Design a protein around this ligand. Structure first.
Ligand code: ZN
Lengths: 506, 573, 226
DNA sequence: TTCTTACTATTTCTTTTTTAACTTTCGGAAATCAAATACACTAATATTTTAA
DNA sequence: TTAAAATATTAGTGTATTTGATTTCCGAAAGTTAAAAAAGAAATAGTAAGAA
């Protein structure tokens, strides 16, 4: 009861009523999912947690599906002010609900527990996204020409699809398989902002599919019941949603690297063998296969050899490499959890009184929605992604079932008789092969002699027919077809800037 | 810390950086330079850092030593001073007997033909005062004296006091006789009129007419006759005769003048011509009064009036971007603008000093545009005094030039205008110029000049400055005995300064590196200190309260010797 | 960390044109450290608070902060011509941590969380030179003659020294040492307050005629008037 | 004919040395200052157009 | 014939506003320390001849 005045006299009244507006929105929204049920307005009842706050922020700020107000974000002068308004009001809503969190303490509502640093990470995430879209604002933002206009991802990425690295490395990168394992680790650190150790710890068994999403690539990284602490929960959840660009897609890169790793060239690149998966145990084989390998078959390749790799590549594309900023940890990272809320909040039956459960929409398969789309370099502003029907020429499965057909055998094998992770990984691989054949014609369009095309079954005119399908206007068009990057569209969809990316035969 | 530092320090001037203002600093808390932080604010000195410091000492010196205890201070004691039942009316009735009618007239026509600018600053028509001389001797026989007639009595006897102060010894000897006085006075008949007897009889005539004013009850009935009488008497050394009484009567005068509450003196189009002439008359009375306000400015003068007149610079700088009556006030008001720095250690910067100089050439040409008649001693009187004042201000101005910034050859300027002033005194040794050596403007100006030339020649011994010292040393003895002991104390001062000239050169300037220890410096400290101590009236206040009884090294020993020999307090009476 | 928002910069560069100005008031403690807590720093490229308009002002209000001397010294080196410094809702203040410019009379405050004092209780005991328990026991009359009971201030013990024990010297000297904190300010006016560290020492001339006053004495008692 | 037997990357770990980011004196250059002007009200009174 | 309607000079005073100093310090360049990368050698896990 001592908390009266210093709560009250903490603020300007103007501040207090802006905060009152914001928590009034919060209360109405919790009644909109009847969390507080239906003026019915107590204080020792209203739950405050970082995910609750966060999902309120989702449902109000970012959820611009909203067809009455759909396309303010398209106009540059509207969005350039609108997102600044978003982030300012974001910070104010954070302060408001922090104030309300302290308010529930003086009423003694134990249901209010903040963990601001999670919401600080939300703040930092949206801050970095708006600063990314802000630094990209103009060709002549300042007197720069092409290096503001040089994404360190794509200039590397596209130039890694070349079957030759002649000035670069005959010492290192003869094989395209080594180029693809480099591109795999680079798109790891690109999409999944991690450390070298965190890049090391990917078995195949921690690579799952979207439950409510079909497209999520779940790396359900959990502390294994012992760091100093049992009850294993430190949950780090990640995703590799594909890219409309067929050359920075993680799924395309992954399917390509695993094709060369498993099958490769039938003469030259004799693969590592498509795995057993028959008397596999859940945890036996997929929990042994590294996502990438060198000479060893189980562990992860050598650290300073990767340092050499990144050094050679960033001197090839002439970019400032700094080793801490890829091998050591950043803080621009993914959400982190307990066991407590993770089991508690994602259980629907504890919240089954509600009209909706947040696992459905704003948490696509236990992922905070902006931590999905920002890390996958997307404007996070629909909550209702329906871009999946955008598919000129969906590829035929008869071409698909040529490579990796053992998967098709395994589901015509005793599908029960295989381990649970195994067939789930098999369906993962089929989605990978689908995305692979989908993105294949531009790979043929730009490097027709990759080691994938050291296989004349692809040289047959069924694949070439599908190549002429997807690359149909490519010879006649001045510009490209596929998407680029949210602030690099009007530069590199031009074929010429796209060819300035190439150094060896544009 | 607490009670921190003030401004960027020696470490800050060492590094030219931000000054975090701590103890030692935040500057000095970084790199451990507290010795450099504190050795900015014992052995023998080896620099010329004594001289700028000593020129800045000269200012506060000159505000006291040349100014107050030597001149503007009379030590007194309530027990020592008698009451006034005797020589109450009696000495006044003596001096009202001893003066005679033709004895009045010859003095009047002396002062009429020779002192025109004075009563031009006072009354104008001195023959209207001849009428009052005529009405006096009728009124000498009278008894029931009105207040107005007694005001005219005070006015005429103040003028009679003025006449003694400028008449030469020869004409006064032709009118009077030493022996009837020195039998009544009982003093030595052997002395002349010039050797204080002009002075003593002048002070007598002053005291009598003030006692006439005491018979007037002027404090019951103030009128401008008082101010005119005071402006008459202020031309003498009566401010050095009775400075406290002079401040009292000055206070009464400003009270009487402002009792009519008149600001501007140039009238409207539609006044009485008597009224218009009256306001213009108060015009010249006002400027002569504020001149005395400036000249009697001291700590025993707590009431100021020339602050109310604005500066001449703030008016003249606009248009640059009788005539001699206002010109006297121009020069004196320009001195007023000059010398607030006497007790202020802040420097006058090098523009308004240059504004004063570059106007002062126009003032010089205005002095040049004036005339002097060799027939009219009123006219030589009129020109010579302005010709004195212009070089007086010019000397003080260039002294400021050399002191505050070492303006080049301002020493040579000092010597140049000193030559001019010496030759002005030289011109006074002629016929119809003798009493020009009697007005106290020389008694201050020459004192300041000889004191600064002494001050320069104690330390920077220039043989031209030493030659100027020899010339002023001769000029010491070239002065009338009308100035009295203030003359003689100057003779003491021209002694004691020169005696300080002994002690400085013979003993090396000791220090601690900057705290320049010399017994000469400490002598010059205690010079100011004892004078300011006796300038306090608080001891007299505790005496006035009654039962509150008034209570109380080589660098040391040489001070102990020279001051026990040379008392600085040898300059009172 | 010296940095500002552009609107405030636009305000300050336009601030000069007033010539009718009073009562400058700031709230942001960060901004407070930059703009009037002068901190010695007489120079920044922009952000110059214009000596003329430093001079013009009459009074200063400081609304809501934590400590005015987050630095070692809450200075007012400039701001020559203030009269009424007023503190609304800062948490802790040292009275000693202020430089208090030339001649101002009122210094009122309210709603604070912590008050030091100018620690004058120690400085008294240098002069009469007794023990603090003698000073609290022998040297307390706790006068409530008739004018003290005009107001209540009944939360507070309203003390006064003894007229008998002190021989009226080391009383006037004691009182002048009380004054020497104040630099001739008069109006003090303690509203709602919290946590005085020291005692409460007020000179007699300033409490008589009630130029100092107290409105909401809550966390506070034991005022001596000397 | 596959146990020796030193090649052969390799690779691992240490050095060093080379890179690069963080902190610190040095010429110039802005931030006050008591004048010091140039401005600038403002008034008194001479100054610029007209019938009975 | 002019009072009425309405500027110009000097003067008295007052108030912003430069000013050259002058002061106080900032932007930039030399240290300082920590990361990154090749270098170099010390195992090293394969790795092709040479007999029984
Ligand atoms: Zn310093």
């Amino acid at each position: 009861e001592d908390r009266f005045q210093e709560l009250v006299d903490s603020l300007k009244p103007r501040t207090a009523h802006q905060y009152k507006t914001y928590y009034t929105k919060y209360i109405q929204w919790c009644q909109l999912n009847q969390i507080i049920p239906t003026n019915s307005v107590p204080y020792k009842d209203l739950p405050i947690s970082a995910e609750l706050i966060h999902w309120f922020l989702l449902d109000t700020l970012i959820t611009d599906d909203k067809p009455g107000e759909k396309r303010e974000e398209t106009e540059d002068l509207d969005e350039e002010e609108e997102n600044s308004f978003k982030i300012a009001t974001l910070k104010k809503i954070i302060g408001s609900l922090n104030f309300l969190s302290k308010l529930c303490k003086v009423h003694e509502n134990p249901n209010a527990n903040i963990d601001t640093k999670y919401l600080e990470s939300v703040t930092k995430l949206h801050t970095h996204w708006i600063d990314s879209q802000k630094a990209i604002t103009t060709n002549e933002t300042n007197n720069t020409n092409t290096q503001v206009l040089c994404p360190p991802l794509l200039k590397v990425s596209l130039n890694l699809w070349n079957p030759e690295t002649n000035h670069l490395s005959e010492k290192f990168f003869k094989t395209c398989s080594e180029k693809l394992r480099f591109l795999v680790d680079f798109q790891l650190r690109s999409y999944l902002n991690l450390s070298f150790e965190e890049r090391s710890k990917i078995r195949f068994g921690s690579l799952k599919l979207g439950k409510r999403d079909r497209d999520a690539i779940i790396y359900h990284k959990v502390t294994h019941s012992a760091e100093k602490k049992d009850t294993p929960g430190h949950h780090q959840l990640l995703a590799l949603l594909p890219q409309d660009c067929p050359f920075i897609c993680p799924q395309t890169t992954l399917a390509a690297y695993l094709y060369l790793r498993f099958y490769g060239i039938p003469s030259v690149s004799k693969g590592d063998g498509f795995p057993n998966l028959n008397a596999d145990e859940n945890g036996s084989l997929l929990q042994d296969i590294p996502i990438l390998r060198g000479k060893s078959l189980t562990t992860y390749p050598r650290e300073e050899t990767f340092s050499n790799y990144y050094t050679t590549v960033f001197r090839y594309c002439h970019l400032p490499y700094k080793r801490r900023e890829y091998f050591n940890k950043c803080n621009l990272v993914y959400p982190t959890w307990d066991e407590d809320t993770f089991r508690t909040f994602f259980n629907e039956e504890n919240h089954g009184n509600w009209l909706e459960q947040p696992e459905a929409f704003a948490f696509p398969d236990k992922i905070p929605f902006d931590f999905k789309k920002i890390m996958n370099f997307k404007s996070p502003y629909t909550s209702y992604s329906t871009n999946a029907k955008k598919d000129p020429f969906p590829p035929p499965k008869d071409l698909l079932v040529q490579i990796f057909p053992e998967i098709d055998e395994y589901k015509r094998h005793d599908y029960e008789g295989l381990s649970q992770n195994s067939r789930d990984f098999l369906d993962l691989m089929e989605v990978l092969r689908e995305r692979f054949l989908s993105n294949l014609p531009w790979i043929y369009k730009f490097f027709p002699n990759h080691d994938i095309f050291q296989d004349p079954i692809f040289g047959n005119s069924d694949f070439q027919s599908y190549f002429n399908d997807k690359t149909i206007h490519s010879k006649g068009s001045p510009i490209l077809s596929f998407d680029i990057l949210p602030g690099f569209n009007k530069i590199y969809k031009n074929k010429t800037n796209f060819y300035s990316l190439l150094i060896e035969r544009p | 810390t607490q009670l921190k530092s003030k401004h960027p320090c020696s470490v800050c001037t060492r590094r030219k950086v931000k000054c975090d203002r701590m103890i030692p600093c935040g500057n000095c808390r970084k790199r451990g330079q507290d010795s450099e932080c504190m050795k900015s604010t014992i052995t023998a000195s080896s620099s010329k850092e004594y001289l700028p410091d000593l020129l800045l000492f000269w200012q506060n010196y000159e505000y006291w030593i040349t100014n107050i205890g030597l001149y503007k201070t009379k030590q007194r004691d309530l027990t020592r001073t008698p009451a006034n039942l005797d020589t109450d009316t009696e000495e006044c009735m003596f001096w009202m007997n001893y003066l005679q009618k033709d004895q009045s007239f010859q003095l009047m026509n002396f002062a009429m033909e020779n002192l025109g600018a004075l009563y031009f600053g006072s009354i104008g028509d001195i023959s209207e005062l001849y009428l009052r001389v005529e009405q006096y001797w009728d009124r000498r026989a009278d008894k029931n004296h009105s207040v107005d007639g007694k005001y005219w009595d005070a006015l005429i006897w103040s003028v009679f006091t003025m006449c003694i102060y400028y008449m030469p010894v020869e004409k006064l000897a032709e009118i009077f006789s030493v022996y009837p006085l020195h039998e009544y006075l009982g003093s030595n008949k052997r002395l002349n009129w010039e050797d204080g007897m002009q002075l003593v009889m002048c002070q007598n005539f002053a005291r009598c007419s003030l006692f006439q004013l005491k018979q007037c009850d002027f404090m019951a009935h103030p009128d401008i006759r008082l101010v005119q009488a005071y402006l008459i008497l202020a031309t003498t050394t009566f401010p050095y005769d009775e400075p406290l009484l002079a401040n009292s009567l000055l206070t009464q005068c400003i009270h009487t003048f402002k009792n009519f509450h008149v600001d501007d003196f140039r009238p409207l189009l539609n006044d009485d011509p008597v009224e218009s002439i009256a306001k213009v008359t108060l015009g010249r009375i006002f400027y002569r009064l504020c001149g005395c306000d400036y000249l009697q400015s001291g700590p025993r003068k707590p009431i100021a009036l020339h602050t109310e007149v604005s500066s001449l610079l703030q008016h003249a700088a606009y248009l640059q971007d009788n005539s001699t009556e206002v010109l006297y006030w121009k020069i004196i008001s320009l001195d007023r603008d000059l010398d607030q720095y006497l007790n202020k250690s802040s420097k006058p910067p090098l523009k308004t000093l240059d504004a004063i100089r570059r106007e002062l050439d126009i003032f010089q040409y205005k002095v040049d545009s004036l005339e002097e008649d060799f027939r009219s001693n009123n006219s030589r009187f009129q020109k010579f005094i302005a010709l004195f004042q212009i070089s007086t201000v010019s000397w003080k101005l260039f002294k400021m030039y050399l002191i505050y910034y070492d303006t080049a050859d301002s020493l040579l300027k000092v010597i140049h205008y000193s030559k001019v002033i010496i030759s002005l005194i030289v011109n006074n040794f002629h016929a119809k110029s003798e009493f020009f050596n009697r007005h106290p403007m020389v008694m201050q100006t020459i004192t300041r000049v000889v004191s600064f030339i002494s001050f320069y020649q104690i330390f920077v011994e220039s043989a031209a400055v030493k030659q100027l010292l020899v010339d002023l040393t001769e000029l010491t003895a070239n002065l009338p005995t009308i100035f009295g002991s203030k003359l003689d104390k100057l003779v003491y001062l021209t002694e004691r300064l020169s005696k300080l000239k002994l002690l400085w050169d013979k003993v090396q300037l000791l220090d601690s590196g900057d705290s320049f220890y010399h017994p000469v410096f400490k002598i010059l400290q205690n010079d100011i200190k004892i004078i300011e101590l006796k300038n306090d009236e608080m001891f007299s206040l505790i005496k006035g309260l009654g039962s509150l009884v008034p209570l109380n090294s080589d660098f040391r020993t040489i001070v102990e010797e020279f001051q026990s020999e040379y008392n600085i307090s040898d300059i009172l009476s | 960390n010296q940095l500002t928002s552009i609107s405030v910069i636009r305000t300050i560069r336009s601030m000069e044109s007033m010539k009718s100005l009073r009562k400058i008031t700031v709230r942001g403690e960060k901004l407070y450290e930059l703009l009037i807590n002068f901190h010695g720093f007489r120079d920044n490229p922009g952000k110059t608070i214009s000596y003329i308009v430093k001079r013009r002002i009459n009074e200063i209000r400081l609304s809501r902060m934590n400590q005015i001397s987050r630095t070692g010294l809450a200075d007012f080196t400039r701001w020559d011509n203030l009269q009424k410094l007023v503190l609304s809702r800062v948490a802790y203040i040292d009275l000693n941590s202020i430089v208090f410019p030339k001649n101002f009379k009122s210094l009122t405050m309210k709603r604070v969380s912590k008050i030091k004092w100018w620690n004058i209780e120690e400085n008294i005991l240098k002069e009469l030179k007794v023990d603090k328990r003698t000073f609290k026991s022998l040297y307390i009359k706790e006068d409530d003659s008739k004018f003290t009971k005009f107001f209540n201030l009944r939360h507070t013990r309203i003390k006064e020294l003894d007229k008998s024990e002190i021989n009226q010297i080391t009383y006037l000297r004691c009182q002048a040492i009380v004054w020497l904190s104040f630099r001739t300010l008069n109006h003090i006016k303690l509203q709602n307050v919290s946590e005085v560290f020291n005692n409460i020492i007020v000179p007699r001339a300033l409490f008589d005629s009630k130029r100092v006053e107290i409105y909401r004495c809550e966390k506070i008692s034991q005022v001596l008037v000397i």
